[PDB]
Design a binder for this molecule. Structure first.
Ligand SMILES: COc1ccc(C(=O)C2CCNCC2)cc1
Ligand SMILES: COc1ccc(C(=O)C2CCNCC2)cc1
Ligand SMILES: COc1ccc(C(=O)C2CCNCC2)cc1
Length: 460
């Protein structure tokens, strides 16, 4: 039985509005409704992994797991296995996988982050799951961010707290947050960003929706505008939205948006918005293709509609040679040439790098770089040809060209990372000096850049 080089992943997000679901929710897992929908001819083909995020979920874990498993069995005739389930308050993530993947899945982690302080601590936050699928690390975050049209900045803060504090993936990657720990990271949920148009324009917005004219609404979607201004979700992707706003509906129909201010809303308007979203971030030059992104039309127990997204995702096999794992493949090397970091910091410490990769036995610390001043104010840290030659565990190009090197630039004074990034080894050539580049982030914000040249030697 061959190991796969692709899998498909279903991501669902649904704010259930504290109501039990209806008896049939199969349209969700089939990617049927509005938007970028899945072809009917695929209906019986199971996804490899289903990741279900709920918010305002009133069910027990057992109750929801039974509904999910029965749904998938009805669609696919496959009895899915539970990889992980994690709940914080009424925010939940379930990961289900095909039974044939049971020995391909390992290192399963779960965590949660509670957002805000005192007043604001008590129902918002995130849950997450990570695991390895053969040689590929996968992370999944379901967040329910702060509500309210005038709280986009608080949502952005909630995002940064979640990506700082959610403890998933390989704890040895200590300088790296979740935005660098995974081959593929999916972040979804009731992100609660709104269409920022005047209250008076509510009926105009409804008209636009009825005409399926989303362009003048999406141009005011706070998540898109905040992302464009690099305020949130830097270096994440989202498929184009081609479905109607998924909030806020009258229950038991989808014919009416309930937007007007009510005691129950704290006298807030809920103009129709795309609260419910799926975003992703994959390491450079890894295959990831969104094959659906939409909302259901027939699940109406909540004031939100379910959102689905599906992805093709490249995966690699758990490589064994005669040499690695448990020794180097002396036929392999990675040389970082003429490298420099450009940092936005005002500090004057010396910096060193750490190179982290599952192709190394353990992370590698460089010598300190040479600080210079850039022409427009910047700190430039030069490493020259001083960087340590990296010795991968396996030299086979079919393995090595699929790997990635995470880079942290750390202060000598504090050992704190000032910037993190990632370099693909999917090069155009081996034994050839080639340009490399990554932006550097810290706490998911841009802090600088790393650029230079690489020379990769494989056994070919
Ligand atoms: C300290 O305050 C807490 C602690 C736990 C919760 C939960 O909901 C747990 C989280 C993990 N899995 C079961 C449920 C909420 C607030
Ligand atoms: C097919 O879905 C799967 C795949 C893998 C697992 C596991 O590896 C379990 C997880 C808990 N600790 C180790 C065993 C479970 C379900
Ligand atoms: C039209 O509004 C936008 C435009 C761009 C963004 C982005 O952040 C990325 C940039 C890099 N990859 C693709 C899109 C978000 C909203």
């Amino acid at each position: 039985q061959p190991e796969p080089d692709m899998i498909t992943i279903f991501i669902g997000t649904w704010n259930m509005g504290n109501a039990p679901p209806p008896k049939k929710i199969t349209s969700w897992f089939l990617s049927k409704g509005q938007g970028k929908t899945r072809d009917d001819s695929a209906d019986y083909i199971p996804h490899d992994i289903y990741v279900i995020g709920t918010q305002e979920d009133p069910l027990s874990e057992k109750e929801w797991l039974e509904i999910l498993k029965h749904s998938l069995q009805e669609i696919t005739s496959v009895t899915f296995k539970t990889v992980a389930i994690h709940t914080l308050w009424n925010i939940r993530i379930v990961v289900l996988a095909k039974p044939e993947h049971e020995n391909r899945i390992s290192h399963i982690c779960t965590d949660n982050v509670k957002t805000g302080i005192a007043n604001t601590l008590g129902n918002k936050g995130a849950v997450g799951v990570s695991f390895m699928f053969n040689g590929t690390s996968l992370g999944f975050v379901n967040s329910h961010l702060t509500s309210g049209s005038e709280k986009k900045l608080r949502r952005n803060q909630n995002y940064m707290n979640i990506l700082r504090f959610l403890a998933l993936g390989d704890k040895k990657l200590s300088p790296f947050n979740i935005t660098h720990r995974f081959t593929h990271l999916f972040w979804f949920g009731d992100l609660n960003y709104r269409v920022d148009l005047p209250t008076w324009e509510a009926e105009t917005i409804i008209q636009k929706i009825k005409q399926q004219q989303y362009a003048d609404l999406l141009s005011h979607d706070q998540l898109l505008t905040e992302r464009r201004e690099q305020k949130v979700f830097l270096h994440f992707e989202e498929e184009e939205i081609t479905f109607a706003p998924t909030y806020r509906f009258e229950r038991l129909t989808r014919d009416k948006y309930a937007y007007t201010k009510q005691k129950a809303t704290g006298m807030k308007y809920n103009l129709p918005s795309w609260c419910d979203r799926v975003l992703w971030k994959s390491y450079p030059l890894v295959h990831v293709v969104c094959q659906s992104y939409g909302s259901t039309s027939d699940i109406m127990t909540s004031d939100h509609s379910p959102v689905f997204a599906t992805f093709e995702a490249g995966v690699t096999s758990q490589f064994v040679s005669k040499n690695g794992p448990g020794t180097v493949d002396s036929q392999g090397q990675i040389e970082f040439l003429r490298c420099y970091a450009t940092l936005k910091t005002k500090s004057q410490t010396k910096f060193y790098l750490e190179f982290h990769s599952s192709c190394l036995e353990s992370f590698v610390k460089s010598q300190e770089g040479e600080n210079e001043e850039g022409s427009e104010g910047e700190l430039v840290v030069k490493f020259g040809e001083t960087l340590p030659k990296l010795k991968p565990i396996i030299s086979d190009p079919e393995y090595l060209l699929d790997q990635h090197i995470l880079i942290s630039i750390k202060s000598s004074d504090s050992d704190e990372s000032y910037g993190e990034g990632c370099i693909a080894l999917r090069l155009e050539a081996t034994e050839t000096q080639l340009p490399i580049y990554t932006p550097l982030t810290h706490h998911g914000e841009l802090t600088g850049h790393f650029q230079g040249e690489i020379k990769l030697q494989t056994s070919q």
